[PDB]
Design a protein around this ligand. Sequence first.
Ligand SMILES: [Fe+3]
Ligand SMILES: [Fe+3]
Ligand SMILES: [Zn+2]
Length: 277
Amino acid sequence: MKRDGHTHTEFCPHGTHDDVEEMVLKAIELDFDEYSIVEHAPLSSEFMKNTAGDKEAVTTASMAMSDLPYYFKKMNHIKKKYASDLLIHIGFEVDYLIGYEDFTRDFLNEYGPQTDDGVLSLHFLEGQGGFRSIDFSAEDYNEGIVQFYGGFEQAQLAYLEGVKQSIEADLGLFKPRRMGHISLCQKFQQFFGEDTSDFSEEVMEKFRVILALVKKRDYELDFNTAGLFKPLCGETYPPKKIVTLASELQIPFVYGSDSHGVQDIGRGYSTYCQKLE
Ligand SMILES: [Fe+3]
Ligand SMILES: [Fe+3]
Ligand SMILES: [Zn+2]
């Protein structure tokens, strides 16, 4: 079986704007038999008033609430059109917004019924001047988060604390059960002269606490290969060491290409397969 549980569409402001249909055709060409469309859920309007850093990171983050009806219509159309070649799931990559669980829970309670899969991801942390992006750019990440927390490791620990909160969070019945790329704090590794070969003992303990909790919650993890194709990253989310700990805990992994265009489809799938061994 070949499944991709993390893909995006033309409804993504920062995507390549390729049509999801062309992405689905490519996935079929590459023998995938299960495919999930988890587009970025609209951010909280309140949340957007409390951010700092590059505005593009926010304005470009996701589609508007008004686009929702159109998103579901298009995706439900593609789902049926290709049901014969691919089992397509429709959902959202839901942003865990620290301090805004009510908003998220309300959003999920309303639109959750129209979804069939999902991913809960941490993309913003409190930083210099307000909420800051973890993945917009190396310079932005450095000024908004790394310097704010005191250093790369301090940033790692604040990031994992956020991941821990997203797992513990009560976001209703429709809360995603697959945690997105749980080592996103490494996306700009090399810009800080860092890599996954030397996670400190504290960082490792937080990962162990996080994993034990994922198991207890009976959640699963997004094995995201996007990192293998980012200039300053070069690693899968999460790295081998974490994958091994998770597997030993029988925590399920679902391959996630995090595709934002046709050319991303299927990327790093072999790595995913081998890394699980
Ligand atoms: Fe993400
Ligand atoms: Fe994504
Ligand atoms: Zn995206």
